[PDB]
Structure formats: C-alpha cells, structure tokens
Design a protein around this ligand. Structure first.
Ligand SMILES: *[C@@H]1O[C@H](CO)[C@@H](O[C@@H]2O[C@H](CO)[C@@H](O)[C@H](O)[C@H]2NC(C)=O)[C@H](O)[C@H]1NC(C)=O
Ligand code: NAG
Lengths: 50, 49
C-alpha cells in the first residue's frame, strides 16, 4: 500500500573554510591611491572574496 | 541378452527470486517536487506494482 521512510531535518556538512586567500587589505588599506587620469588597474583571481 | 541400469540428470528451472520495486524511490526518491510531478503521469506506478 505504501512505503516507510523518515525525512531529514537539518542541512550542515562540515564547516566553512575560506580564509580570504587574496589580500584585499593590500589594495583597500593603502597610504597612497591613484588618480583619475592614471588609475591603477588590479586583476585578482584564484582566491576567495569575502 | 543383457541390460544395464543408468542414471541421468535432468535440471529444470522452477522460479527465480521475487522482485518488488518502488517507482518514486527508484526514479528520484526523496524529492518533493519530483513526487508532485510524478502524479501527473496517471497510474503507471500502480500498473507496474
Ligand atoms: C551382463 O552384464 C553384467 C555387467 O555388465 C555382467 O556382470 C559381470 O559378470 C562378470 C562375470 O560374469 C563379473 O566378473 C563382473 O564383475 C560382473 N559385473 C558386475 C558389475 O557385477 C553379467 O555377467 C552380464 N550377463 C550376461 C548374461 O552376459
Ligand atoms: C588599516 O585600516 C585600519 C582601519 O581602517 C587603520 O586603523 C590602519 O591605520 C590601516 N593601516 C594602515 C597601514 O594605514
């Protein structure tokens, strides 16, 4: 007539592990910034953004 | 003028293992949207059972 099965309740696996590989603080906490005519272009890849 | 007695084997199958299948478990299992979608197919699962 039917089947017997219990349902799950929570969805958690292990833990978070990002650690912001790339130093965004290097480009965001600096004593000197570029100008409007000559703006410094930085390419960030192979990291994690938080 | 003489005779011999011989024994020969004869193997005949009778049955196999009885099998039962649940359609909603075998197809998707623990998916609610799949469960709601499968009821639009009619009595296919009932016919298979
Ligand atoms: C019919 O065949 C059987 C066996 O094929 C014969 O029995 C044998 O007889 C000889 C001597 O007569 C013995 O040395 C064997 O040991 C017997 N065999 C067995 C299995 O016991 C029998 O003699 C034959 N009868 C006739 C009339 O030919
Ligand atoms: C980095 O940022 C913090 C908070 O905005 C500031 O106090 C600190 O002076 C900064 N570092 C430098 C080297 O300016």
């Amino acid at each position: 007539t039917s089947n017997f099965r219990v349902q799950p309740t929570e969805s958690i696996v292990r833990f978070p592990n990002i650690t912001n590989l790339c130093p965004f603080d290097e480009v965001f906490n600096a004593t000197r910034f570029a100008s409007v005519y000559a703006w410094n272009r930085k390419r960030i890849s192979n990291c994690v953004a938080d | 003028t003489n005779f011999t007695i011989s024994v020969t084997t004869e193997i005949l199958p009778v049955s196999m293992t009885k099998t039962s299948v649940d359609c909603t478990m075998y197809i998707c299992g623990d998916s609610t949207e799949c469960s709601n979608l499968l009821l639009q197919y009619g009595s296919f699962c009932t016919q298979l059972k």
